[PDB]
Write a protein that binds this ligand. Structure first.
Ligand SMILES: Cc1cc(N2CC[C@@](C#N)(C3CC3)C2=O)cc(NC(=O)Cc2ccccc2)n1
Ligand SMILES: Cc1cc(N2CC[C@@](C#N)(C3CC3)C2=O)cc(NC(=O)Cc2ccccc2)n1
Ligand SMILES: O=C(C[C@H]1NCCC[C@@H]1O)Cn1cnc2cc(Br)c(Cl)cc2c1=O
Ligand SMILES: O=C(C[C@H]1NCCC[C@@H]1O)Cn1cnc2cc(Br)c(Cl)cc2c1=O
Ligand SMILES: [Br-]
Ligand SMILES: [Br-]
Ligand SMILES: [Ca+2]
Ligand SMILES: [Ca+2]
Ligand SMILES: [Ca+2]
Ligand SMILES: [Cl-]
Ligand SMILES: [Cl-]
Ligand SMILES: [Zn+2]
Ligand SMILES: [Zn+2]
Ligand SMILES: [Zn+2]
Ligand SMILES: [Zn+2]
Lengths: 487, 468
């Protein structure tokens, strides 16, 4: 069984859960982890959804090189200098030094935007809407954590270029809403949509929109996905331009966006829904939604029981429920109950001889442990209903927790008190970078780490009163901003 | 398209892959951008192969790209040596293939025979930093592939899988890409040194008279399980351990390059309907009649989508119809569906098939039926022509002189062969301006069976050729 308790040592519980659910295997290189099928399948579910949705918006998939030349990486002001010591450099092939070192992509702006500049020769060439599913590398020496913060990770990065600001601004919010759908509708995780402050936005962009999630077990928030409006900053840098004949003597620089989402998704799912029995899969992304286990197991009664289990399997498959029949003779029914509970399968379907003879079975929900006796004839109906109820239940519980842990404060003193209780706080804020630094410094100083901004919510809990001051007291508030201790 | 396939193939190829918007060049050599038109073909291959291996019980995963020095050493490898300006404690290698990352995990996952089989696949990128001359799709420094790695308790289930995977690869080439291939096994010289035997599919590119390996499926036997200690308890004998039997298999975007080299023509790319992102492109050729024509095009679009035909209506105002004809011809779209006002008012349309250029006039009410028929015929036609080509260019020669002569005509040859490494080296140096290498020992040779070296008897008919 799982013996680590989530409320006692969270980091050990997390390591136990991700390994005993067979999601993660550790590699011999720090910050690099093997995604076993149980975790990879969740990424595949997210991919299926998001891929279909961006195709509806006109985005097409592609694959750009993993390697960036020294010249291309350092040619334009695409990234702040603090990232320099975290680029992984290939310097030799076999035993002999390369003429010029080449970098592993940490993101693909510097490989994609020179090609965009080649491809945009007139108005007709826009828009360009490309996505790629790929791995990136950011070689930090801070402590890594499986799924949440790693050196190599899988993601998707979309990059779009448009003739007008309005088309681009529309896409930014559409993509952000798809990310919120990934978290809320697939993973049953509530998120807060907002704009990053000036300090936390992508430096080279116009503005950054974000979704923020809350991990109550650690009292910390974490960014779930991001959608940037780059404006014309990168088009001016890379000369992504066209000319209108109706406007002679003027360049038209493309308006650009970029957006990304990673396997961090899975880690947040694990941290939010996981419990002291192990992983808990939302039915929308569970590789296996129902596991059928023969229990209470004569020598032809046994064959009848096995055939009944396969009857349920085929009926469920027939109604698009993802189902596995664990018919292993080697393992005890208790062993199987435990194995699939650790893996978070939403429903265990128990079939024993007595129930078979009485044309019934037992369904056990993973989230609550509730057991239900179901008539055989209702199998497809009831189980679908139960799966839907599990999904809602998970979201509802997580939403309640966010509601208790995200609150309004209008003074530094109240903010400090609430923050130190392990919650995130919406405060009136002047938006200035220096003030944000001061908030981090003084909440660190006065705690009894510093708070960072998470986002400026699009829909704050309260509306800023006229003349309301920032918590710094010195400048008027520009907006309610969500702050907390962060991942 | 200006360049001609029959004169300057390399230039023809560069023009076709760029004007079809499949490839863009990168500022590092041997690395190429896969634009959507190319990537879509890879996605179609992936959809097929992924479904098929799932039916065999293979599960997808993702192992790390980085290999430690020690694990790798238990070679044109790209080495990471620093992060920023900070030298790493130890250099780490980019995977050229994932045996050395996967099999330590395999050895930890296998304790009893109940832990077998293990059947894992990953769709990923690998890196082989050679300085030989690269070619888009066909031979590149970084490439997308799938690598499957399986572990079993017995030799027999492993052997079964090797052959099933090779047949899936032959399905990818022959059924999806309309490319005939020759199944066989590699000679001692050419087989994977880390395995017991290597099965392969070989394809032929007549424009260069050269063969190319399309995919590969190895039986590794107990080589790697002895090296990495992938062991399980003997079910009958107390205390005794057995080593697992293993396979690995792989397939890359080389597929798309072979498809381009085989079916492409002097008008550009030619897509087999089974992998074409767009199978039919609808092109329009009084304000009321303008609106009605657009609506008719949209009718065809919706009807073809309703019958699961992949269709785009190019209703764009900012491009001439002739520009569209040429654009979608360069891209190899199998069928151009032309609707003009007169066609609309005659309840008919024109379908132009890309492979032959034939223009068919089709009654409107038959749109869904006939177009499906035409798509099927295009697929078959492509395959049939390619097979004709292969049969024309693969012949038996039972003596060296004829073999050399056959080879210099730009063909590949099945010869009686002894199998010895020394002899294969001698055939290479003799036939040299490259000398011929062995391609495979065909499962089904042209003729039933001494070597063409004389000094030895022939162990098998072997297919030899100048190879990519
Ligand atoms: C797994 C994962 C995810 C993400 N990030 C980033 C923001 C983002 C969001 N939202 C991306 C835009 C989509 C995200 O998920 C970032 C990372 N590694 C790193 O920072 C490097 C690293 C390595 C070791 C320790 C600490 C840090 N690792
Ligand atoms: C695109 C592609 C494909 C393949 N290979 C290999 C055999 C195989 C088959 N069949 C794999 C098992 C699946 C295949 O496709 C190999 C490659 N690059 C290389 O050798 C490196 C290289 C780079 C520049 C010049 C010369 C050589 N590049
Ligand atoms: O990667 C980004 C901005 C956006 N790029 C497209 C995908 C979504 C993503 O939010 C910001 N970023 C983040 N981390 C980086 C690390 C390094 Br090292 C470098 Cl060089 C550059 C960067 C860098 O540019
Ligand atoms: O990669 C292979 C053997 C098989 N691995 C699984 C996928 C299918 C493939 O045929 C052979 N191979 C090929 N090229 C290599 C290049 C280098 Br560099 C290294 Cl270290 C190792 C290798 C190496 O092992
Ligand atoms: Br980022
Ligand atoms: Br290989
Ligand atoms: Ca001006
Ligand atoms: Ca709390
Ligand atoms: Ca012994
Ligand atoms: Cl679902
Ligand atoms: Cl029934
Ligand atoms: Zn799975
Ligand atoms: Zn302030
Ligand atoms: Zn496409
Ligand atoms: Zn010989």
């Amino acid at each position: 069984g799982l013996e680590a308790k989530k409320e006692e040592n969270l980091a050990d519980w997390y390591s136990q859960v991700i390994t005993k659910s067979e999601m993660i295997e550790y590699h011999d290189i720090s910050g690099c982890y093997i995604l076993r099928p149980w975790a990879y399948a969740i990424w595949e579910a997210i991919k299926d959804f998001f891929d279909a949705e961006i195709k509806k918006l006109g985005v097409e998939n592609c694959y750009f090189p993993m390697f960036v030349s020294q010249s291309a990486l350092e040619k334009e002001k695409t990234h702040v200098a603090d990232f320099a010591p975290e680029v992984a450099w290939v310097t030799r092939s076999g035993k002999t030094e390369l003429a010029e070192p080449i970098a592993i992509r940490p993101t693909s702006e510097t490989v994609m935007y020179p090609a965009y500049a080649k491809w945009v020769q007139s108005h007709r060439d826009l828009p360009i809407k490309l996505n790629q599913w790929c791995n990136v590398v950011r070689w930090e020496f801070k402590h890594p954590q499986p799924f949440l913060r790693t050196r190599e990770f899988l993601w998707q990065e979309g990059h779009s270029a448009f003739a007008t600001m309005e088309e681009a601004a529309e896409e930014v919010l559409q993509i952000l809403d798809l990310y919120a759908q990934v978290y809320e509708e697939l993973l049953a995780i509530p998120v807060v949509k907002g704009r990053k402050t000036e300090k936390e936005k992508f430096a080279g962009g116009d503005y950054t929109t974000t979704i923020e999630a809350f991990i109550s077990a650690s009292g910390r928030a974490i960014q779930g996905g991001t959608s940037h409006h780059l404006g014309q900053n990168f088009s001016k840098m890379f000369e992504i331009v066209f000319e209108d004949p109706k406007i002679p003597g003027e360049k038209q620089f493309a308006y650009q966006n970029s957006w990304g989402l990673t396997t961090r998704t899975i880690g947040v799912m694990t941290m939010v829904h996981g419990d002291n029995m192990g992983l808990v899969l939302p039915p929308r992304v569970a590789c296996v939604q129902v596991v059928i286990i023969p229990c209470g197991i004569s020598e032809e009664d046994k064959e009848a029981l096995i055939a009944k289990c396969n009857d349920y399997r085929r009926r469920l498959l027939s109604v698009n429920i993802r189902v596995r029949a664990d018919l292993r003779d080697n393992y005890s029914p208790g062993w199987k109950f435990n194995h699939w509970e650790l893996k978070g399968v939403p429903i265990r379907l128990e079939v024993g001889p007595r129930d078979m003879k009485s044309c019934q079975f037992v369904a056990v929900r993973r989230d609550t442990g509730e057991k239900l006796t179901v008539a055989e004839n209702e199998a497809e109906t009831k189980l679908q209903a139960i799966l839907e109820d599990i999904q809602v239940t998970l979201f509802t519980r997580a939403s309640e927790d966010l509601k208790t842990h995200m609150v309004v404060a209008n003074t530094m003193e109240d903010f400090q008190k609430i923050l130190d209780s392990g919650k995130i706080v919406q405060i009136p804020f002047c938006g200035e970078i220096d003030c944000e630094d001061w908030i981090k410094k003084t909440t660190a100083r006065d705690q009894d780490m510093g708070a960072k901004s998470l986002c400026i919510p699009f829909k704050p809990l309260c509306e800023l009163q006229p003349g309301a001051k920032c918590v710094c007291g010195k400048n008027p508030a520009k907006y309610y901003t969500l702050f907390g201790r962060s991942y």
